[PDB]
Design a binder for this molecule. Structure first.
Ligand SMILES: OC[C@H]1O[C@@H](O[C@@H]2[C@H](O)[C@@H](O)[C@H](O[C@H]3[C@H](O)[C@@H](O)[C@H](O)O[C@@H]3CO)O[C@@H]2CO)[C@H](O)[C@@H](O)[C@@H]1O
Ligand SMILES: [Ca+2]
Ligand SMILES: [Ca+2]
Ligand SMILES: [Ca+2]
Length: 195
């Protein structure tokens, strides 16, 4: 399916900007197994970047396993050109950040990825920025996926939550991503002061 992404430019600090309250939560509902972990995320875009705000409810946080996706973490996938290829092209991105703000890339330049996390009672928040290589405009469509990895006290992933892919293959197959469509940038972006 498709998420419509509003235009805006948040501050990366792990805190919920005022402007994020003007955008809607996406609730990923594709669970690998039953768990009391759940998550939500908001998206926003500006001329230079896509922004993700994710909150995860997860009573046990673990990142003792040295394999990244075996820690409590979120993963963001982007098919920037909207090629929808079946394997990863040089513009396809797959990033991961754990609840301590440790970042990994499975695909794409990690210098494009900038994140903050915050520990919450019973969970964590991730606020992320991905620098875009193509100037986005109203109507731009990209492929996108969001995933949560749940780990437990044994230091292993026990479940995943996905927005769009129910097959376990987004890490190999961009055609499995959903779509985001960018809207809402005023054309006349010329703004006199007015105190
Ligand atoms: O027969 C089942 C076998 O599964 C193997 O595992 C792999 C592989 O080792 C991992 O690299 C891969 O990891 C990806 C996550 O599944 C995915 O959700 C995320 O987007 O991307 C991760 C980064 O690659 O996971 C699969 C497990 O599903 C086992 O290692 C074998 O022993 C098993 O037989
Ligand atoms: Ca913020
Ligand atoms: Ca692509
Ligand atoms: Ca956990």
């Amino acid at each position: 399916k498709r998420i419509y992404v509003s235009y805006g430019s948040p501050v990366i600090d792990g805190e919920v900007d005022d402007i994020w309250n003007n955008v809607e939560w996406n609730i990923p509902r594709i669970y690998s197994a039953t768990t009391q972990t759940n998550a939500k995320f908001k998206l926003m875009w500006d001329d230079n970047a896509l922004y993700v705000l994710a909150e995860v409810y997860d009573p046990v946080l673990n990142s003792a396993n040295s394999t990244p996706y075996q820690q409590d973490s979120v993963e963001i996938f982007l098919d920037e050109n909207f090629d929808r290829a079946i394997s990863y092209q040089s513009d396809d991105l797959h990033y991961r950040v754990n609840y301590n703000n440790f970042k990994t890339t499975d695909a794409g330049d990690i210098l494009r990825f900038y994140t903050k996390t915050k520990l919450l009672p019973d969970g964590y928040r991730v606020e992320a920025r991905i620098a875009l290589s193509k100037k986005p405009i109203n109507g731009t469509i990209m492929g996108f996926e969001f995933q949560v990895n749940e780990a437990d006290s044994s230091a292993r992933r026990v479940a995943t939550i996905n927005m769009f892919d129910n097959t376990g293959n987004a890490w190999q197959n961009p055609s499995l991503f959903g779509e985001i469509k960018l809207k809402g940038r005023s054309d006349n972006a010329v703004v006199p002061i007015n105190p």
